[PDB]
C-alpha cells in the first residue's frame, strides 16, 4: 500500500503532509517551497500550476486562475460572488446558475468550474508527495474552513476525487491545527482552544471545546477579506509615491511595473519578520529607471498599524459569542504565514496578558500537518 497524505488548500497557499514513522513530514516542492501557490494559468502551449503560474501573473493575468476557494461549492448569484468578481483579473461567467472561470487554452476559449480548478492544484500536490514518496498516492484527507457549508464541503471533495484521490475525509483547519500540537489528547477535563488563523488573503478566529477527545467549535470571526495580500499593498502604495518623489513619475497606471513591485515588497515582508530592514532592488522597473531602496521594520510595521492592530476586534467578538473570558482559554495556537509577523505576535500576547503562544510548528504548515496526522490514524498508520 501507500501513504495517506494530509493536504491543506488554502485560499492563497495550498500545503501537503505525510505522516511516517512517528514523524511528520511537510513535503517541499520543485522549487522546495514547502508550500505552493493555489494558481493556475494557460497558456499557447500549456497549464502552468503552483510557483510556475504565480511566476507570471504580471504577464498573463485574465489567464492565470486564483482564489478558486472563493468561488467552491457556491452560486454565481451569490451576493459574494457578486462582490468578489469585481476584482479578479480573469472572467467568471454563469452557466446554469453555476460559476464558471473562463479563460483561453492554446489559442481556444474554454471554461472550468471552481472544482475542476482546485482539482489541478490537488494534482500537484499529489505528484509533489508522489515524487517524494516515490509510490503512488491515493488516500489523502483535505481540510476546509470551519464556516463551509454542505455544499462547499462536497465541492472540495468532488475537486479530490477529480484529481484520483480518494478522500478519506474533510476535517476543519483549525481542528487540525489543534490535533498538530496534540490538544486532542484526552486530559479528563474541556480545554478551550484559540486558533489565530491570517493567511494570504483570509483572517479566521476560532474558539474550540475539546472534551474527551471530541471537538466543538464554539465560536468563530475574522475576515474574509484580510491577510498578508493586504500588508503587502500598503508598501505598494508607499513605495508608488517613493517613486514618485524620487523620480517625478506615476507608474500606477502600467500594471506590469505594479505586479513586479508587489512581488518585490511580498518578499521584504518576509525579510522583515527575522531582519530589521530589508532592500528592494527592481531593475528597469518604469521606462527604464531601476528602483533600488529599502524599508525598515520600523516603517512596515507603521504602514500598517490600523489593520494589525484591528486584528484583535474579531478576537473579543470570539471571545464574547464564546461567552469567556480571557483568562478562561487554556491554548493558543497561530496558524497563516502573515502570524510569523513580531508585531502581531506582540499584540496577541499583551491581549492575553502574556500568554505564551503555540509556534513552534510553521504556522503556514500547521492545518496541513494536523491532517497527515488524522490521515494516519485513519489509515491505521497510526
Ligand atoms: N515570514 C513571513 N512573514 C510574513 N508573511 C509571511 C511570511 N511567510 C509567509 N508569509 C505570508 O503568508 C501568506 C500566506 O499564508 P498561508 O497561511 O500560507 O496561506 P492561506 O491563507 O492561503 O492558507 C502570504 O500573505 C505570505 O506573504
Ligand atoms: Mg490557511
Ligand atoms: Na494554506
Ligand atoms: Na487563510
Redesign the pocket.
Known sequence: KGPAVGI?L????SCVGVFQHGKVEIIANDQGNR?TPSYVAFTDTERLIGDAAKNQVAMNPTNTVFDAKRLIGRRFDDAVVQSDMKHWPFMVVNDAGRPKVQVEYKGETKSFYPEEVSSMVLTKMKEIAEAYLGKTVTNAVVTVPAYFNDSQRQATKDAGTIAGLNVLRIINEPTAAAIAYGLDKKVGAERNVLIFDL????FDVSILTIEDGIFEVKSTAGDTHL???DFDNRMVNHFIAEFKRKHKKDISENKRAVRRLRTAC?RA??TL?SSTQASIEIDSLYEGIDFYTSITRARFEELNADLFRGTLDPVEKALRDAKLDKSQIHDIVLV???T??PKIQKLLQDFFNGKELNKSINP?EAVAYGAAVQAAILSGDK
Not at 10 to 13: A, F, K, L, S, V
Open positions: 491543506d488554502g485560499t492563497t497557499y508550500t493567511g494570504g488573503g483570509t491577510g498578508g495580500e511580498e515582508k518576509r519578520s497563516g504565514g502573515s510569523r509577523i503556514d
